[PDB]
Amino acid sequence: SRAEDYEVLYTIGTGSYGRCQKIRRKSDGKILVWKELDYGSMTEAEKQMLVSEVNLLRELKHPNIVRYYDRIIDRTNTTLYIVMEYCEGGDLASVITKGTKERQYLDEEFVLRVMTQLTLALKECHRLKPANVFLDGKQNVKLGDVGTPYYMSPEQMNRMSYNEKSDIWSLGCLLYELCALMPPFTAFSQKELAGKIREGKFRRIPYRYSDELNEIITRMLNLKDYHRPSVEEILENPLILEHHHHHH
């Protein structure tokens, strides 16, 4: 309830809108994080949109989505603290960086676990970048939360639509990058990037990965959203087994 009930261990990152801090609850020593949002220049209405959003997020309870726990208002002042689950495994961006540095591609089994658990998280969301996807202590996957929009789908750069299938395209880019350690479409300019995305061509993921995994990732990257598989069709794939799901 009160910021004074927690000790800040350290800053994890200073992403958009403020900081991400690893904190500890004094009462029982529970490790959490909170996000710092400067309500400073908001409106009596802007604050209302924020409150609606925070209520919505308080609604969600899914093992593959970072869990909301509490909100805290400061009086010294102008700061809203959104208290959330801490994911001890870090983010996928760091996994990819490590694979690069070690010259070591990621296990297919790990990619299949990310595919399964992120697809389930999206399914729940339906009633995305590596730095927004976290791992817990068992390498379970948790969806959380100027730059090149590497994952922008074709229809959304033609302003056509933003639907479930656009999410599927983004998941395709993420899994592709997990496999290749590079996004499917790269470019120095955003116009060049747009051309590459529109063309829809990319290299096969490395040959150490199964044809079946390549096939599903490629299908998610289809130029036509109606040729991309739904979450249900993804989860029906024979590649996806019990042990790829979350386990406490």
Ligand X SMILES: */C=C\c1nc(Nc2ccc(S(N)(=O)=O)cc2)nc2nc[nH]c12
Residue 229 in contact with ligand X, rule: CB under 6 A = no
Q: How far is the CB of 1 from ligand X (least distance, A)?
A: 19
Q: Which string of x and - marks every residue 57-76 that binds ligand X (by CB under 6 A)?
A: ---------x----------
18 is in an annotated binding site: yes
In terms of Cβ atoms closer than 10 Å to its own Cβ (0-12, 13-18, 19+), residue 211 is exposed
Q: Minimal CB distance to Cl ion: which residue?
A: 103
What is Dmax (Cα atoms) for the chain?
A: 58
Q: Which residues bind Na ion (CB under 5 A)?
A: 90
Nearer to ligand X, 20 or 96 (CB): 20
Q: How far is the CB of 30 from Na ion (least distance, A)?
A: 19
Nearer to ligand X, 133 or 217 (CB): 133
| Dihedral pair phi/psi, residue 121, rounded to 5° | -60, -45
Q: Which string of x and - marks every residue 92-131 that binds ligand X (by CB under 6 A)?
A: --x-------------------------------------
Residue 54 in contact with ligand X, rule: CB under 6 A = no
Question: How far is residue 156's CA from residue 78's CA, in Å, rounded to a whole number?
Answer: 36
Task: Decide which of Cl ion, Na ion, ligand X, none touches 176; Cβ closer than 5 to 8 Å per partner kind.
Answer: none
Question: How far is residue 43's CA from residue 244's CA, in Å, rounded to a whole number?
Answer: 45
Q: How far is the CB of 156 from Cl ion (least distance, A)?
A: 27
Sign of CA dihedral 206, 209, 210, 215: negative
203 is in an annotated binding site: no
Nearer to ligand X, 90 or 195 (CB): 90
Binding-site size for Cl ion (CB under 5 A) equals: 2
Residue 86 in contact with ligand X, rule: CB under 6 A = yes
Sign of CA dihedral 113, 180, 237, 134: positive
Interacting residue with Cl ion among 61, 75, 101, 103 (CB under 5 A): 103
Choose one: 20-28, 46-54, 103-111, 225-233; the region binding Cl ion (CB under 5 A): 103-111
Nearer to Cl ion, 188 or 207 (CB): 207
Point out the annotated binding site for ATP.
12-20, 35
Point out the annotated binding site.
12-20, 35
Q: Which residues bind ligand X (CB under 6 A)?
A: 12-13, 20, 33, 66, 84-87, 90-91, 94, 134, 144
